[PDB]
Amino acid sequence: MAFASLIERQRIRLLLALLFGACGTLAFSPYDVWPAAIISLMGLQALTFNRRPLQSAAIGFCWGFGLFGSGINWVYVSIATFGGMPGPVNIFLVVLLAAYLSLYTGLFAGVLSRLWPKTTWLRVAIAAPALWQVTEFLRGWVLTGFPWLQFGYSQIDGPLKGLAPIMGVEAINFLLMMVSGLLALALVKRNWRPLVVAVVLFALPFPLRYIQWFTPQPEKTIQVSMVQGDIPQSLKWDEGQLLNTLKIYYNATAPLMGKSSLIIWPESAITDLEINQQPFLKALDGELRDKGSSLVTGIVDARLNKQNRYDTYNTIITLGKGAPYSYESADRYNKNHLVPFGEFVPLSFSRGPYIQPPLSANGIELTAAICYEIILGEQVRDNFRPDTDYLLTISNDAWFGKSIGPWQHFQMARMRALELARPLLRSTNNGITAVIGPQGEIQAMIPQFTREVLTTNVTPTTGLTPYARTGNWPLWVLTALFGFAAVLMSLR
């Protein structure tokens, strides 16, 4: 046989693209193999060499489909269990989602091989990172976006973690696409120059991780007790289980009063309207103030708005010491970035303001996010303020079941703590509830899929990271400069 007549064939290239896309899903939290991201990106860029724009677009689409048919398949658990659509219909829906998410990768590959047909360093090192940044922005922006499975999140424990506090996780996405292509440039061509360049560009951010952009405050250390109720997702929105859920949470929280300064309940812990459960909240706030503590809990609130029609918000509310409860109080967080097909129909929860004040609780200012909102770095940074002590996130991962989705969500949550240099207090109904340190490090974690309480001492951090001080625009300026240079050098 032969091994040179097979690679040149297009069908073999499509199969290899599928294989590399599938293998790239091993780079995230359930498996935590950061070399898999590099290998997958190297395969993506190397298989598109010497290809026509249409063929390369097809190869990129196949690579994206391989990535998104295995990296995100837990969505099946969110459809088969919760929904009357039969098994084949759920499979078709998952396939449609994977194809839609791979359309952006196909577009990226097609544009890359149209504007930059020849395999040179200008393509792998200059054009590919900028075009990948633009494509990922489009994927995370169009139709409310879905910026899931970004290889920058795979470097939390990797060498390039310290680049996140300076320029943001997407900057890692810029570098991983930049380095891997150079490796690809050293693989197809027997030239050690791209290998040396990639090694240098990968080993430079490694010393840039011992820098602490935060100052710990060993005088405001408080005991936080996050409650994981493990309420089943099948009966959560039932009137018969409303009383049982309240009893479970209250009996889990009552011993914690007087010993934990802050108590946190998961997203939509009170599965009832905020106006309906007024006496319970008032009595709870009175008891919390008597013992001395603050409770931050998720709830669904109905507001008559200005047109006298109800506006439904998925809110986080605060009660107790340092934050008295009232139905009309600014100490509240309304979820802004709703989950498509889970809370609204694109093309019915309402959207809160994009910028909201941080929650105040017993003298502690919390930057709050809800479930899906924690994966959006830009929104969290915009809501972040210098006075913030901890990053607050409440979620409900029971939809995804016993799958890889919860861990990917947890890793994307840890990336926010790494970027903003603030402790992250993640609470979930049955998912991963943890206290992520200022460097994206797990300081505490309780077993998943059980009814437990995570009670640990946590220390605030002050100071601003370069990312939290300038934002995401330096990365966009670098991307624009690289794209302009690559385009201007392509007109010849």
DSSP code at position 488? H
- Residue 366 makes CB contacts below 8 A (sequence gap 6+) with 296, 358, 359, 360, 388, 389, 390, 391, 392, 425
* Residue with the two structure tokens 């009063």: 257
215-470 belongs to which CATH class? alpha beta
Q: What would the two tokens of residue 343 be?
A: 């809370």
List 273's β-bridge partners, or say none.
300
- Are the C-beta atoms of 116 and 132 separated by less than 8 Å? no
Q: How far apart are CA 6 and CA 1, in angstroms?
A: 10
Give me the sign of the Cα torsion angle 475, 480, 481, 487: positive
SS3 400: coil
299 phi and psi angles, rounded to 5 deg: -160, 165
Closest CA to 19 of 38, 1, 43, 49: 43
> In the chain, count of helices (H) and strands (E)?
16, 15
302 phi and psi angles, rounded to 5 deg: -115, 120
Amino acid (one-letter) located at 56: S
25 phi and psi angles, rounded to 5 deg: -75, -10
406 phi and psi angles, rounded to 5 deg: -55, -40
The strand pair at 359-361 and 332-334 is best described as: unpaired
Please work out, in degrees rounded to the nearest 5, the angle formed at the alpha carbon of residue 303 by the alpha carbons of 298 and 304: 170
| Long-range CB contacts for residues 170-175, cutoff 8 Å, separation at least 24 | 170/133, 170/136, 170/377, 170/472, 170/475, 171/475, 173/132, 173/133, 173/136, 174/129, 174/132, 174/133, 174/475, 174/478, 174/479, 175/129, 175/201, 175/202, 175/205
Q: How far apart are CA 423 and CA 463, in angstroms?
A: 12
Q: Using alpha carbons, list the distances in angstroms from residue 411 to 146, 158, 254, 447.
A: 16, 13, 31, 16
3 state SS for 98-118: HHHHHHHHHHHHHHHHHHCCC
SS3 487: helix
- Are the C-beta atoms of 124 and 194 separated by less than 8 Å? yes
- Residue spans of alpha helices (H) in 343-403: 377-383
* Residue with the two structure tokens 């009175």: 286
- Are the C-beta atoms of 60 and 108 separated by less than 8 Å? yes
Q: How far apart are CA 131 and CA 137, in angstroms?
A: 10
Amino acid (one-letter) located at 224: V
Displacement of CA 254 from its chain's centroid (Å): 32
| Burial degree of 304 (CB within 10 A; 0-12, 13-18, 19+) | exposed
- Residue 89 makes CB contacts below 8 A (sequence gap 6+) with none
DSSP 21-70: HHHGGGGSTTT--HHHHHHHHHHHHHHTTT--HHHHHHHHHHHHHHHHHH
Which approach determined this entry?
cryo-EM
262-288 residues labelled b (16+ CB within 10 A) or e (exposed): bbbbbbbbbbbebeebeeebeebbebb
- Are the C-beta atoms of 170 and 135 separated by less than 8 Å? no
SS3 232: coil
SS3 227: strand
Catalytic machinery residues: 267, 335, 371
SS3 366: strand
Q: How far apart are CA 134 and CA 139, in angstroms?
A: 9
- Residue 410 makes CB contacts below 8 A (sequence gap 6+) with 29, 426, 431, 432, 434
Q: How far apart are CA 219 and CA 2, in angstroms?
A: 69
Closest CA to 197 of 125, 251, 263: 125
Q: What would the two tokens of residue 203 be?
A: 């080993």
DSSP 472-484: SHHHHHHHHHHHH
For residues 464, 466, 470, 472, the Cα torsion angle rounded to the nearest 10 degrees is -120
Displacement of CA 478 from its chain's centroid (Å): 23
- Residue 319 makes CB contacts below 8 A (sequence gap 6+) with 281, 284, 285, 288, 294, 295, 297, 325
Radius of gyration of the chain (CA): 24
Write out the H or E segment, with its range, that includes residue 457.
strand 452-458
Q: How far apart are CA 237 and CA 249, in angstroms?
A: 16
List 360's β-bridge partners, or say none.
365
- Are the C-beta atoms of 47 and 93 separated by less than 8 Å? no
Q: Using alpha carbons, list the distances in angstroms from residue 267 to 247, 251, 393, 468.
A: 17, 18, 8, 26
- Are the C-beta atoms of 130 and 483 separated by less than 8 Å? yes
Give the resolution value in Å.
3.0
Amino acid (one-letter) located at 460: P
- Are the C-beta atoms of 420 and 259 separated by less than 8 Å? no
Q: How far apart are CA 67 and CA 82, in angstroms?
A: 24
Q: How far apart are CA 485 and CA 476, in angstroms?
A: 14
Closest CA to 149 of 73, 90, 62: 73
List 435's β-bridge partners, or say none.
425, 444
Amino acid (one-letter) located at 65: F
